[PDB]
């Protein structure tokens, strides 16, 4: 019964394909609802047109800063920040979808898609979904990153929305 969303991603204007994400609203309803609404844009703002600004091969791809486009911003549907809902889901492997933050209870809009098991983040970042399809597109995104996180191409969420 869980929500499903998509990200269509470009590199320097060239489509890479579609990533389809399941949001675990059965475990983290409040965190899933934020992400879903930021994909649809239904509150008047959201991810469409924003970038994957920090991409580190064999680690993760980070995105969601639609206000500042640089890692310093983003906002949630609940305001600038919202609390950590729970830490029930763990960073079990590639494809995990989890919230970026700046310490406890500072969830906004930024998120990451893991390209490995990032279990040292358990208990610190709220996991709220996982990739169902398009992991090959995530691997293309990953290929445009570097150890520093700097990308070699501008990686844009050219479209996003709900599929469920």
């Amino acid at each position: 019964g869980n929500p499903l969303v998509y990200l269509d991603v470009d590199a320097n204007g060239k489509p890479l394909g579609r990533v389809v994400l399941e949001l675990k609203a059965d475990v983290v309803p409040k965190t899933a609802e934020n992400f879903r609404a930021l994909c649809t844009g239904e509150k008047g703002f959201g991810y469409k047109g924003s970038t994957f600004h920090r991409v580190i091969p064999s680690f993760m791809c980070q995105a969601g800063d639609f206000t500042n486009h640089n890692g310093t911003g983003g906002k949630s549907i609940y305001g600038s920040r919202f609390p950590d809902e729970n830490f029930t889901l763990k960073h079990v492997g590639p494809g995990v979808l989890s919230m970026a933050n700046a310490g406890p209870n500072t969830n906004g809009s930024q998120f990451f898609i893991c390209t490995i098991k990032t279990d040292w983040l358990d208990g610190k970042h709220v996991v709220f979904g996982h990739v169902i399809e398009g992991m090959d597109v995530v691997k293309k995104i990953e290929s445009f990153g570097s150890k520093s996180g700097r990308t070699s191409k501008k990686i844009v969420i050219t479209d996003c929305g709900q599929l469920s």
Binding site: R54, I56, F59, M60, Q62, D65, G71, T72, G73, G74, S98, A100, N101, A102, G103, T106, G108, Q110, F112, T118, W120, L121, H125, G149
Partner: peptide, 11 residues
């Protein structure tokens, strides 16, 4: 290190 933060990226 390998963290995912929003403002002061740490080691």
């Amino acid at each position: 290190x390998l963290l995912v933060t929003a403002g002061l990226v740490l080691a």
